[PDB]
């Protein structure tokens, strides 16, 4: 882990939080709980492992429930798409330029499946996270990621990482086991590549 300065605690009150908050939603699937955000009208992107093979997925926009359906799931992909009809909040926009080391960012999500919380963060490093090719295992072998300094929790899974402009830099998908205050974020390029696999293979039963 590359060491960086502690995140600016003032980031919780930054207008960027209130601007993106309505579009960041809590997800409950049937016991399993996570975070998502609006990517396009009536469509929510979330963590695939949270909603994996679930027929009872609910989306909470502003403490109010909306029925969701997993319409895009691929076992080889970290992200999933939920279809959420009549969902008021507008889509969030992805940042077009990659984030740099030391930049102050914010993780938005629902840690422990509670209320919406903004977690102050700082970019450690942009890296290619490559593992071994596990035989018979579908999950990705390589990932474009940001390592971040942040007190991240499994409830933040599927939560967007947002810059000071209000744009999504990536999506929280993990943390370090031995290192506290260390989170792993899929880059906007990585999410695009993963959504591309789904866009290419659809429709699938």
mmCIF file of N, CA and C in Angstrom, residues 46-111:
data_model
loop_
_atom_site.group_PDB
_atom_site.id
_atom_site.type_symbol
_atom_site.label_atom_id
_atom_site.label_comp_id
_atom_site.label_asym_id
_atom_site.label_seq_id
_atom_site.Cartn_x
_atom_site.Cartn_y
_atom_site.Cartn_z
ATOM 1 N N UNK A 46 -24.959 -1.651 -9.351
ATOM 2 C CA UNK A 46 -24.559 -2.102 -8.027
ATOM 3 C C UNK A 46 -23.514 -3.213 -8.101
ATOM 4 N N UNK A 47 -23.114 -3.700 -6.931
ATOM 5 C CA UNK A 47 -22.180 -4.808 -6.798
ATOM 6 C C UNK A 47 -22.871 -6.132 -7.131
ATOM 7 N N UNK A 48 -22.278 -6.893 -8.049
ATOM 8 C CA UNK A 48 -22.855 -8.157 -8.516
ATOM 9 C C UNK A 48 -22.965 -9.222 -7.427
ATOM 10 N N UNK A 49 -22.017 -9.223 -6.492
ATOM 11 C CA UNK A 49 -21.998 -10.205 -5.405
ATOM 12 C C UNK A 49 -23.126 -10.001 -4.389
ATOM 13 N N UNK A 50 -23.579 -8.757 -4.245
ATOM 14 C CA UNK A 50 -24.690 -8.419 -3.348
ATOM 15 C C UNK A 50 -26.018 -8.995 -3.855
ATOM 16 N N UNK A 51 -26.259 -8.871 -5.159
ATOM 17 C CA UNK A 51 -27.539 -9.262 -5.764
ATOM 18 C C UNK A 51 -27.495 -10.611 -6.500
ATOM 19 N N UNK A 52 -26.368 -11.314 -6.384
ATOM 20 C CA UNK A 52 -26.128 -12.572 -7.101
ATOM 21 C C UNK A 52 -27.246 -13.599 -6.930
ATOM 22 N N UNK A 53 -28.017 -13.791 -8.000
ATOM 23 C CA UNK A 53 -29.095 -14.781 -8.036
ATOM 24 C C UNK A 53 -30.278 -14.474 -7.135
ATOM 25 N N UNK A 54 -30.539 -13.187 -6.918
ATOM 26 C CA UNK A 54 -31.630 -12.757 -6.047
ATOM 27 C C UNK A 54 -32.872 -12.366 -6.840
ATOM 28 N N UNK A 55 -34.029 -12.803 -6.350
ATOM 29 C CA UNK A 55 -35.316 -12.477 -6.959
ATOM 30 C C UNK A 55 -36.086 -11.420 -6.164
ATOM 31 N N UNK A 56 -35.574 -11.085 -4.980
ATOM 32 C CA UNK A 56 -36.191 -10.088 -4.106
ATOM 33 C C UNK A 56 -35.219 -8.951 -3.787
ATOM 34 N N UNK A 57 -35.024 -8.063 -4.759
ATOM 35 C CA UNK A 57 -34.142 -6.909 -4.601
ATOM 36 C C UNK A 57 -34.965 -5.629 -4.464
ATOM 37 N N UNK A 58 -34.691 -4.871 -3.404
ATOM 38 C CA UNK A 58 -35.343 -3.586 -3.170
ATOM 39 C C UNK A 58 -34.316 -2.452 -3.199
ATOM 40 N N UNK A 59 -34.699 -1.340 -3.820
ATOM 41 C CA UNK A 59 -33.862 -0.145 -3.908
ATOM 42 C C UNK A 59 -34.475 0.989 -3.079
ATOM 43 N N UNK A 60 -33.680 1.551 -2.169
ATOM 44 C CA UNK A 60 -34.114 2.679 -1.343
ATOM 45 C C UNK A 60 -33.440 3.963 -1.808
ATOM 46 N N UNK A 61 -34.223 4.856 -2.410
ATOM 47 C CA UNK A 61 -33.684 6.097 -2.971
ATOM 48 C C UNK A 61 -33.517 7.186 -1.916
ATOM 49 N N UNK A 62 -34.626 7.597 -1.310
ATOM 50 C CA UNK A 62 -34.606 8.588 -0.238
ATOM 51 C C UNK A 62 -35.406 8.097 0.949
ATOM 52 N N UNK A 63 -34.932 7.007 1.555
ATOM 53 C CA UNK A 63 -35.640 6.294 2.631
ATOM 54 C C UNK A 63 -36.969 5.677 2.167
ATOM 55 N N UNK A 64 -37.229 5.753 0.862
ATOM 56 C CA UNK A 64 -38.425 5.166 0.259
ATOM 57 C C UNK A 64 -38.075 4.021 -0.702
ATOM 58 N N UNK A 65 -38.791 2.884 -0.585
ATOM 59 C CA UNK A 65 -38.502 1.670 -1.350
ATOM 60 C C UNK A 65 -39.014 1.678 -2.791
ATOM 61 N N UNK A 66 -38.234 1.066 -3.676
ATOM 62 C CA UNK A 66 -38.591 0.878 -5.076
ATOM 63 C C UNK A 66 -38.210 -0.544 -5.455
ATOM 64 N N UNK A 67 -39.092 -1.236 -6.170
ATOM 65 C CA UNK A 67 -38.800 -2.609 -6.572
ATOM 66 C C UNK A 67 -37.823 -2.656 -7.736
ATOM 67 N N UNK A 68 -36.780 -3.461 -7.565
ATOM 68 C CA UNK A 68 -35.730 -3.605 -8.561
ATOM 69 C C UNK A 68 -35.678 -5.026 -9.106
ATOM 70 N N UNK A 69 -35.057 -5.171 -10.270
ATOM 71 C CA UNK A 69 -34.872 -6.468 -10.901
ATOM 72 C C UNK A 69 -33.478 -6.512 -11.516
ATOM 73 N N UNK A 70 -32.731 -7.568 -11.205
ATOM 74 C CA UNK A 70 -31.427 -7.790 -11.817
ATOM 75 C C UNK A 70 -31.657 -8.124 -13.290
ATOM 76 N N UNK A 71 -31.327 -7.177 -14.162
ATOM 77 C CA UNK A 71 -31.520 -7.355 -15.603
ATOM 78 C C UNK A 71 -30.205 -7.632 -16.324
ATOM 79 N N UNK A 72 -29.100 -7.345 -15.644
ATOM 80 C CA UNK A 72 -27.775 -7.582 -16.191
ATOM 81 C C UNK A 72 -26.866 -8.195 -15.137
ATOM 82 N N UNK A 73 -26.674 -9.508 -15.233
ATOM 83 C CA UNK A 73 -25.763 -10.226 -14.350
ATOM 84 C C UNK A 73 -24.862 -11.176 -15.134
ATOM 85 N N UNK A 74 -23.567 -11.094 -14.851
ATOM 86 C CA UNK A 74 -22.563 -11.964 -15.451
ATOM 87 C C UNK A 74 -21.586 -12.365 -14.345
ATOM 88 N N UNK A 75 -21.450 -13.683 -14.087
ATOM 89 C CA UNK A 75 -20.568 -14.201 -13.029
ATOM 90 C C UNK A 75 -19.100 -13.769 -13.150
ATOM 91 N N UNK A 76 -18.691 -13.338 -14.342
ATOM 92 C CA UNK A 76 -17.317 -12.903 -14.596
ATOM 93 C C UNK A 76 -17.122 -11.393 -14.417
ATOM 94 N N UNK A 77 -18.138 -10.728 -13.872
ATOM 95 C CA UNK A 77 -18.167 -9.267 -13.755
ATOM 96 C C UNK A 77 -18.484 -8.854 -12.309
ATOM 97 N N UNK A 78 -17.830 -7.793 -11.834
ATOM 98 C CA UNK A 78 -18.028 -7.280 -10.472
ATOM 99 C C UNK A 78 -19.306 -6.449 -10.307
ATOM 100 N N UNK A 79 -19.780 -5.848 -11.396
ATOM 101 C CA UNK A 79 -20.941 -4.952 -11.341
ATOM 102 C C UNK A 79 -22.210 -5.588 -11.918
ATOM 103 N N UNK A 80 -23.369 -5.111 -11.461
ATOM 104 C CA UNK A 80 -24.666 -5.571 -11.959
ATOM 105 C C UNK A 80 -25.621 -4.399 -12.178
ATOM 106 N N UNK A 81 -26.545 -4.560 -13.123
ATOM 107 C CA UNK A 81 -27.555 -3.540 -13.414
ATOM 108 C C UNK A 81 -28.920 -3.961 -12.881
ATOM 109 N N UNK A 82 -29.565 -3.044 -12.164
ATOM 110 C CA UNK A 82 -30.927 -3.236 -11.688
ATOM 111 C C UNK A 82 -31.878 -2.344 -12.471
ATOM 112 N N UNK A 83 -33.019 -2.904 -12.862
ATOM 113 C CA UNK A 83 -34.078 -2.131 -13.498
ATOM 114 C C UNK A 83 -35.044 -1.651 -12.426
ATOM 115 N N UNK A 84 -35.152 -0.333 -12.288
ATOM 116 C CA UNK A 84 -35.947 0.273 -11.226
ATOM 117 C C UNK A 84 -36.925 1.308 -11.802
ATOM 118 N N UNK A 85 -38.136 0.859 -12.197
ATOM 119 C CA UNK A 85 -39.140 1.750 -12.785
ATOM 120 C C UNK A 85 -39.586 2.847 -11.824
ATOM 121 N N UNK A 86 -39.850 4.032 -12.377
ATOM 122 C CA UNK A 86 -40.360 5.192 -11.630
ATOM 123 C C UNK A 86 -39.401 5.709 -10.549
ATOM 124 N N UNK A 87 -38.103 5.528 -10.778
ATOM 125 C CA UNK A 87 -37.076 6.007 -9.858
ATOM 126 C C UNK A 87 -36.750 7.475 -10.152
ATOM 127 N N UNK A 88 -37.136 8.385 -9.234
ATOM 128 C CA UNK A 88 -36.999 9.836 -9.430
ATOM 129 C C UNK A 88 -35.577 10.374 -9.703
ATOM 130 N N UNK A 89 -34.568 10.013 -8.873
ATOM 131 C CA UNK A 89 -33.261 10.676 -9.009
ATOM 132 C C UNK A 89 -32.610 10.568 -10.393
ATOM 133 N N UNK A 90 -31.885 11.625 -10.814
ATOM 134 C CA UNK A 90 -31.205 11.646 -12.107
ATOM 135 C C UNK A 90 -29.914 10.815 -12.101
ATOM 136 N N UNK A 91 -29.430 10.409 -13.290
ATOM 137 C CA UNK A 91 -28.167 9.674 -13.381
ATOM 138 C C UNK A 91 -26.946 10.488 -12.952
ATOM 139 N N UNK A 92 -25.927 9.791 -12.453
ATOM 140 C CA UNK A 92 -24.626 10.394 -12.174
ATOM 141 C C UNK A 92 -23.728 10.247 -13.397
ATOM 142 N N UNK A 93 -22.785 11.172 -13.551
ATOM 143 C CA UNK A 93 -21.885 11.190 -14.706
ATOM 144 C C UNK A 93 -20.487 10.724 -14.298
ATOM 145 N N UNK A 94 -19.900 9.851 -15.111
ATOM 146 C CA UNK A 94 -18.539 9.384 -14.883
ATOM 147 C C UNK A 94 -17.519 10.427 -15.317
ATOM 148 N N UNK A 95 -16.453 10.558 -14.533
ATOM 149 C CA UNK A 95 -15.332 11.423 -14.885
ATOM 150 C C UNK A 95 -14.592 10.838 -16.084
ATOM 151 N N UNK A 96 -14.195 11.707 -17.007
ATOM 152 C CA UNK A 96 -13.543 11.277 -18.240
ATOM 153 C C UNK A 96 -12.029 11.128 -18.083
ATOM 154 N N UNK A 97 -11.472 11.791 -17.072
ATOM 155 C CA UNK A 97 -10.035 11.754 -16.811
ATOM 156 C C UNK A 97 -9.719 10.972 -15.531
ATOM 157 N N UNK A 98 -8.679 10.112 -15.573
ATOM 158 C CA UNK A 98 -8.277 9.321 -14.405
ATOM 159 C C UNK A 98 -7.792 10.176 -13.233
ATOM 160 N N UNK A 99 -8.096 9.728 -12.015
ATOM 161 C CA UNK A 99 -7.707 10.430 -10.795
ATOM 162 C C UNK A 99 -6.216 10.274 -10.506
ATOM 163 N N UNK A 100 -5.643 11.269 -9.831
ATOM 164 C CA UNK A 100 -4.220 11.267 -9.492
ATOM 165 C C UNK A 100 -3.988 11.027 -8.001
ATOM 166 N N UNK A 101 -2.796 10.532 -7.671
ATOM 167 C CA UNK A 101 -2.355 10.326 -6.290
ATOM 168 C C UNK A 101 -2.522 11.591 -5.443
ATOM 169 N N UNK A 102 -3.097 11.427 -4.253
ATOM 170 C CA UNK A 102 -3.229 12.522 -3.294
ATOM 171 C C UNK A 102 -4.524 13.310 -3.386
ATOM 172 N N UNK A 103 -5.271 13.108 -4.470
ATOM 173 C CA UNK A 103 -6.529 13.820 -4.695
ATOM 174 C C UNK A 103 -7.572 13.461 -3.641
ATOM 175 N N UNK A 104 -8.264 14.474 -3.129
ATOM 176 C CA UNK A 104 -9.331 14.253 -2.160
ATOM 177 C C UNK A 104 -10.617 13.837 -2.860
ATOM 178 N N UNK A 105 -11.158 12.715 -2.407
ATOM 179 C CA UNK A 105 -12.353 12.117 -2.986
ATOM 180 C C UNK A 105 -13.296 11.698 -1.866
ATOM 181 N N UNK A 106 -14.510 11.295 -2.224
ATOM 182 C CA UNK A 106 -15.488 10.864 -1.228
ATOM 183 C C UNK A 106 -16.142 9.550 -1.648
ATOM 184 N N UNK A 107 -16.239 8.627 -0.694
ATOM 185 C CA UNK A 107 -16.997 7.394 -0.862
ATOM 186 C C UNK A 107 -18.408 7.642 -0.340
ATOM 187 N N UNK A 108 -19.401 7.399 -1.188
ATOM 188 C CA UNK A 108 -20.799 7.525 -0.784
ATOM 189 C C UNK A 108 -21.448 6.150 -0.726
ATOM 190 N N UNK A 109 -22.087 5.842 0.397
ATOM 191 C CA UNK A 109 -22.728 4.547 0.563
ATOM 192 C C UNK A 109 -23.537 4.393 1.832
ATOM 193 N N UNK A 110 -23.894 3.147 2.127
ATOM 194 C CA UNK A 110 -24.687 2.815 3.300
ATOM 195 C C UNK A 110 -23.964 1.735 4.109
ATOM 196 N N UNK A 111 -22.920 2.133 4.867
ATOM 197 C CA UNK A 111 -22.178 1.186 5.698
ATOM 198 C C UNK A 111 -23.101 0.518 6.707
#
